[model samples]
Target chain A: TVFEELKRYVGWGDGDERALRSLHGAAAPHFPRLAEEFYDRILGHEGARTALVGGESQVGHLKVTMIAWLDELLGGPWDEAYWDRRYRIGRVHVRIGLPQHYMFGAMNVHRTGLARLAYERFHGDPPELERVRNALGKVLDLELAVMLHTYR
Target chain B: TVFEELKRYVGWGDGDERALRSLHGAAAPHFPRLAEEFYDRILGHEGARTALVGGESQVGHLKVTMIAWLDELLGGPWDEAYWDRRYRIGRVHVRIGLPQHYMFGAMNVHRTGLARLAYERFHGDPPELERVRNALGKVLDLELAVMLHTYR
Candidate 1:
């Protein structure tokens, strides 16, 4: 049901694998499948609520890569919604009582560390990783309440 | 056979490998070798075809770049045969392919030269030299054949 709900936000149309061909042509073939699995297993399966938070984290990983690939293809200056979705997923994980690191550590660390390196390289600045960490904290507080209310 | 076939069409799948994440991520990488092989062979082989064509007289050079990179991306106002497959490739060289220079030079004296520069600088301006050359019959019949066929 999570995927169905998310589908309301990001509708999947009959693009006749146009997106698939384009993504495959651009060399990210696995994404289309990951997205399909998210729809089937996370949203469609029974007992998904028991693991909604974990599913959110897994879906977060898949969503970020897909968005990144599309941005590259479309010559994007990506908007905040890209990062916002990850924050939402992080919150969902927290709601289900998963440690943030357990759910989000792999992606969060790579993305945040890369940002730190870029910032340090450009401005010789100390890590502002806490800026993201703090923001994610607030979002997690907000998302846990929302998911609990929705699923209960 | 798959590798060789990949070499021809996918060009090593280099474009794809640059886009994927490692095994630590959710999606596995696809067609890395195919993309790598493409970039390696492309410059010396197909790039040779493209560069020789690009480095020829102005119109020819412009046409070649247009064919190789731009036309494929944009689907310009020209047909695929001339853009994707050079019509004069086998007709002139017999051993390797069209020299590109000869086809360019054969097309015209002025349209391939001063007029081309004029067009480059002021594309909106009418191709004055080309119009005059076309009017005066200075362009060769074989060259016209090449142009028509190349664009076909």
Candidate 2:
């Protein structure tokens, strides 16, 4: 399972389950149902291939959660295709409205919490982030499919 | 007997008690005793011609009312001289304190309401509106005086 593989990537096999346990608790409240379903259906699935060779799936999910929260903040009434096209996802320019400045300020409010839990949980490996990005994109594609179905 | 004269303005002949009663209901609330005294003792007695000339006095008063209303809708702490200068009543370009676009929209709303009521009552003869404009200017002048006094 990627769960066992994750500890190696994050260099957390040195017996610090405190940071891992804290990350699980922090993520649980907001994405309880989604996290449960993903673990049951995808992460624990025997057919699932290992993409993140350097970091845990939680690190990938953190990136995904931040991206989703950003989507919520930018959400507005879909008045026309113009607005949708104006703020299209999967583009480089999308970072402009990513709330990076606001996130920086907000993150500062709980610097100790993030430093202990979030920063410690996610490692410095760039390949782990890229793998997580691909995995997160796959799930978001499903989300967009559902959203478009509702609109039609 | 301005009431008697008012009856005639509404095209009521002598002894038309019902019509006179209606006119009284409409105009009674706005007799403007102080303004009348000022006009009679000053402008009228000073040979400015007190009688409603082609309903010009009423028209001027209406203009005063309208311009003041426009100023308010434009979010103005405006001086009366602003409207006065625009309509050639005064020369000073009084500060209205808002952008021109704001005033433009507010004035449009004012004109629409004026068009509705004036059309219903006088039909083609919108000379009453001119009096409303005049009244608006006078009211705004009073407002400026009060505001200035407050500041002082």
Candidate 3:
């Protein structure tokens, strides 16, 4: 119901999902870079650094998890099952004492990074690029709202 | 160019702006409470703590600023003028070394808190409430993008 309401709220439709579907491939190549840069940004933050805990080994696994999460974000059947999986990350963050401020910034890193990559990959295809970016906003908004929903 | 592209890309339109307009009045009463609570959460964490240089005197000023910011966010005509004003705050944050993650949480405090208040205000007016929240999402996305864009 939340998805459905939010879905229509922002004009999320089959077209947007198709737009999103187009990005899974474009987004694949940059996952390693994006994931690492994401972690690097977190490491720079005092609060995020404290909450991150563990060593490079844990970082390695977390990076892998991020890549997987990004993949799923673009590659989706987008059902309730998918939502629960996405939502679990929120719960983990909440439990870890990761403050909410980081959530916005962290998501921003993934979003801006991944979206930038998508723009480059789709370069010269103005129409499809617009399509992808629009869908990107729609889907990412959905993801962010549900993530915040965990706290609500 | 950035606002034009992002505005359309996010499906932001005249309709969405009007929906946001509906929230300006609805948000006023809660500003005081929301401002204090926002500060409380920031104070709750040491990571955010050290970055903040001011004592309660500055805290009072920050709270006042947030209330004013929220008022402007919802009250706006949302032109380039509004954006320039909003963007400066981001620039200020960058100068102050406020972690990006905190932007996420801090904005969330205002947004979610405001949205929750809007819902209650528009209670039983399902259509209007839906309009307000959806517009809230669109406008906030616009806000976050430009704020993050400041980093780039």
DockQ of each: 0.01, 0.00, 0.03
TM-score of 3: 0.54
Return the DockQ of model 1. Answer: 0.01
lDDT at A27, model 1: 32
lDDT of each residue in A1-152, candidate 1, tens digit only: 33222222222223412332322333344446434443344344333324545566766775676556433322322234533554465565557664221221122222222222322232222222223222222222222222322322
Q: Where is model 3 chain A poorest over a 10-residue stretch in terms of lDDT? A: A1-10
Supply candidate 1's per-residue lDDT for A52.
46
Estimated TM-score for each candidate:
0.19, 0.17, 0.54
Q: Best by DockQ, which number? A: 3
Candidate 1 lDDT over residue span B13-112, tens digit each:
3322221111102111212322233233323443233534433365444444433432221122223453234344424343444432233222222222
Error of 2 at A67 (Å): 7.4
Off by over 4 Å in 3: B1-152
- Point out where model 1 deviates above 4 Å: A1-25, A33-77, A104-152, B1-152
- lDDT, residue B84, model 3: 90
With candidate 1 superimposed using the best TM-score fit, by how many Å does residue B88's alpha carbon deviate from the native?
A: 71
DockQ of 2: 0.00
Instruction: Write the residue-wise lDDT of candidate 3 on B1-152 in tens digits.
Output: 45554564344678877877777777788889989877876766556667667787898888888888888878878898988987888899888876554555555555546656765676467567656766776667667766755654
lDDT of model 1 at residue B134?
24
lDDT tens per residue, model 3, A55-125: 87999999899888988888887888998886888888878766544565566566656656665676467
lDDT of 2 by residue, B40-147 (tens): 332222122333354766656845654444434233333345434334311111242322112212222222232233223432343443333223222322322222
